Design a protein around this nucleic acid. Structure first.
Ligand SMILES: [Mg+2]
Ligand SMILES: [Mg+2]
Lengths: 177, 74, 104, 53, 136
RNA sequence: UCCCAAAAUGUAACGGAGGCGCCCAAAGGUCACCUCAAGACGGUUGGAAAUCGUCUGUAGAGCGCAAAGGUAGAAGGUGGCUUGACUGCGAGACUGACACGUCGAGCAGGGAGGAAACUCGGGCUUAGUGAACCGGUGGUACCGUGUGGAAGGGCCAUCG
RNA sequence: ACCCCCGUGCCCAUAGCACUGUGGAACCACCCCACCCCAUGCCGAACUGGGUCGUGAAACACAGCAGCGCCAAUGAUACUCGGACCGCAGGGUCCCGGAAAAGUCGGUCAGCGCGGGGGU
């Protein structure tokens, strides 16, 4: 399951387009961090289990409810209260979710056209602006609580953006041409 | 306001060159300005003291970390 | 990242101890088990698993620790104070300790 | 060292057989019930020691 | 003129000039020759007056902002502590401190503006010229 | 707690500012592990800050409160185990006119954490408190006016 | 003896960052696997167990480079111990010594140890 095409359709295609002197210097995929927007405007102790469970069924891993940064501004901010969520996928579980996103996630989306081609993180990384959750093969509105959005971040080991974009698309990433 | 005030104290008590004894208090301070060197212990209130007999020795490595050691005679 | 190794260096008192200290470098597959003086920056017995290993780079964790204690008998060491780096005292590093604590 | 109805209190020390006080400033603010410990009184030591009056 | 926010009170002490320079931010300058205290109001005195003599330009620099609060006597008595928090601000000035400096105008046009803005001051002053090149 | 205070210490005013009369079964002991503020770039209920990621970053943060000193090898942040916030002591020093106050190695009877060296007799320290008399409670048995008890009185601790 | 690598000190920026080059199986790192001893309040990233290939890219080591940091004269000056004076005063001067800061010249990106290992 995967990994085989992760190399053949990537590594060898890079020295035949660029010029790597090493199979180690070849841009790789480090981790895929998923962030969850919770609380703040929607301070609900019930909404917490809403994401806590779903996130644990879509990525197959218990997430961590990252609290506040202990900052109290003028609006609704408190000292140390669950408001964020962290779901870091790396290694085996990474490609497991990743593959599902390239085969079922992105393809199966209403009004889907692709993703912004402009170079995002200028450090060799990339970021995704996922929104609606009613576009996943694990999310079933017929057996949940409500409807919310999730953020996915692609962390790689690329040096430049030129070597990053290549890696993403070859691995499986659609763009609006 | 005129009201409020405090006698305070602090400072150094055994200066360098001096011959200490087992229990003599060396320097009093609030923080960790003078770190306990060789032969020198440190109290709750960062109050430096001597373990045995010897001579007071100051060491400075360009500020920041102060040290006080005790070189025995014998 | 470099904090684990220093937290055991500042911790292990040097002078007031009066003792010696045994270091250990097992982040790889090349333990030194080097022994170092408390004041003088020298080395006495100095073990290592560099001279052959008989195809073993992990199992000799206890072989070198037995070799050490025995190598220390030729100098005159009774007390040793260990000073691991980023090592939570688990297995590969535990074998040294145990082997050089009963073989001495 | 004021002493009123306010939260926290000064506590007497008892013991299993032992008859000794430790004098400790507790507080009914948080977990306020398990004021038990282990303070050996002049004795063999190792006696069940709850300051709980 | 006045500070936007400070501690409030101060003290009093006059040493020699430190951060005063012969020429910058223009061609001609005006320097004091006696230590004293230059009130905020006195600065308005000088600035406004030099603006009457200079219709256009706005090349009048004043880098002696007063940073020194002074107390005052409210009525009488002496049975009290800090009296008169808000009185006036004074900027200390030592011989060789440049208070004023102008440019664009000629020689005559400058001998008048400093002159005039010299009679208001509690101390003597002299007007100088360029030929200084310390730091930059 | 700073300044005045004039480079030991000390030093006054109805001189200039800001706090305390507490808190914590953990913010303790110890044992392990993590490293900050902020800015820029790019990202979804955001659109200022914040949640995430990657770089810069002697830390411009944090340390329960006021302030200074000090801390990156932590006195920053977490977890496991515990009740050393122990008892009987203390060479020798700081400080005060006295009385108080402050620091403390080591020794003993017993325990705590760690493999261990080792550390621990409250909390980064400096405020969070007050003599004696009188009385309350527990403990222990010294006195107890003829004797043996008892009332009471003393002592240890501790409360008002 | 030559040199290099690794580990560990003294020293704790005149020994630091950046830029660039060199190093490939002796050493180092990445990397590979990791159901279990052990562990990340989520992730075997980091700890950790068992070990090939590959590569030196990154990290690290070394070397050049000193644009930036750091260190920093000489001279003079500020100030001041001592002595002696002036103004109504805020202040200021002379004699005799000590003597800054900053800036400038300039300096240098170390040096000095121990042990072990592999090469000539
Ligand atoms: Mg003084
Ligand atoms: Mg009376």
């Amino acid at each position: 399951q995967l990994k085989t095409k992760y190399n053949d359709q990537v590594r060898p295609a890079l020295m035949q387009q660029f010029g790597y002197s090493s199979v180690m210097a070849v841009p790789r995929i480090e981790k895929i961090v998923v962030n969850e927007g919770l609380g703040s405007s929607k301070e609900d102790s019930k909404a917490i289990d809403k994401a806590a469970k779903e996130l644990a069924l879509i990525t197959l891993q218990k997430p961590i409810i990252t609290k506040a940064k202990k900052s109290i501004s003028n609006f609704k901010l408190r000292q140390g209260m669950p408001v964020g969520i962290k779901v870091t996928l790396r290694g085996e579980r990474m490609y497991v979710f990743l593959e599902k996103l390239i085969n079922i996630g992105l393809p199966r989306i209403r009004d889907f056209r692709g993703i912004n081609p402009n170079a995002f993180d200028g450090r060799g990384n990339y970021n995704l602006g996922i929104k609606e959750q009613l576009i996943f093969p694990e999310i079933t509105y017929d057996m949940v609580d409500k409807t919310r959005g999730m953020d996915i971040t692609i962390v790689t080991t690329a040096k430049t953006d030129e070597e990053a974009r290549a890696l993403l698309q070859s691995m499986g990433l659609p763009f609006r041409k | 306001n005129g009201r409020d005030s405090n006698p305070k104290y602090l400072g150094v008590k055994k200066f360098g060159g001096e011959v200490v004894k087992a229990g003599n208090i060396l320097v009093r301070q609030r923080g960790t300005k003078f770190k306990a060197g060789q032969g020198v212990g440190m109290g709750r209130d960062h109050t430096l003291f001597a373990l045995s007999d010897g001579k007071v020795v100051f060491i400075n490595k360009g500020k920041g970390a102060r040290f006080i050691s005790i070189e025995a005679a014998q | 990242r470099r904090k684990l190794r220093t937290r055991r260096k500042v911790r292990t008192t040097t002078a007031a101890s009066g003792r010696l200290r045994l270091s250990v470098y097992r982040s790889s597959k090349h333990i030194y088990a080097q022994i170092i003086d408390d004041s003088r920056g020298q080395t006495l017995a100095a073990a290592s698993s560099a001279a052959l290993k008989s195809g073993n780079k992990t199992d000799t964790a206890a072989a070198v620790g037995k070799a050490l204690a025995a190598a220390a008998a030729e100098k005159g060491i009774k007390q040793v104070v260990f000073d691991r780096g980023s090592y939570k005292y688990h297995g590969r590093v535990k074998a040294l300790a145990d082997a050089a604590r009963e073989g001495g | 060292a004021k002493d009123g109805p306010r939260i926290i209190v000064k506590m007497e020390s008892s013991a299993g057989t032992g008859f000794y006080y430790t004098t400790t400033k507790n507080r009914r603010n948080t977990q306020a019930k398990l004021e038990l410990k282990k303070y050996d009184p002049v004795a063999k030591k190792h006696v069940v020691f709850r300051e709980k009056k | 003129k006045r500070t936007k926010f400070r501690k409030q009170f101060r003290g009093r002490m006059t040493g020699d000039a430190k951060g005063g320079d012969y020429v910058a931010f223009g061609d001609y300058g005006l320097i004091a020759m006696e230590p004293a205290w230059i009130k905020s109001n006195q600065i308005e005195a000088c600035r406004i007056v030099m603006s009457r003599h200079f219709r256009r330009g706005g090349k009048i620099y004043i880098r002696i902002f007063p940073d020194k609060p002074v107390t005052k006597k409210p009525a009488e008595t002496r049975m009290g502590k800090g009296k008169g928090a808000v009185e006036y601000w004074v900027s200390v000035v030592k011989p060789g401190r440049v208070m004023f400096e102008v440019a664009g105008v000629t020689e005559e046009q400058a001998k008048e503006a400093f002159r005039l803005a010299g009679h208001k001051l509690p101390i003597q002053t002299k007007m100088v010229k360029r030929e200084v090149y310390d730091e930059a």
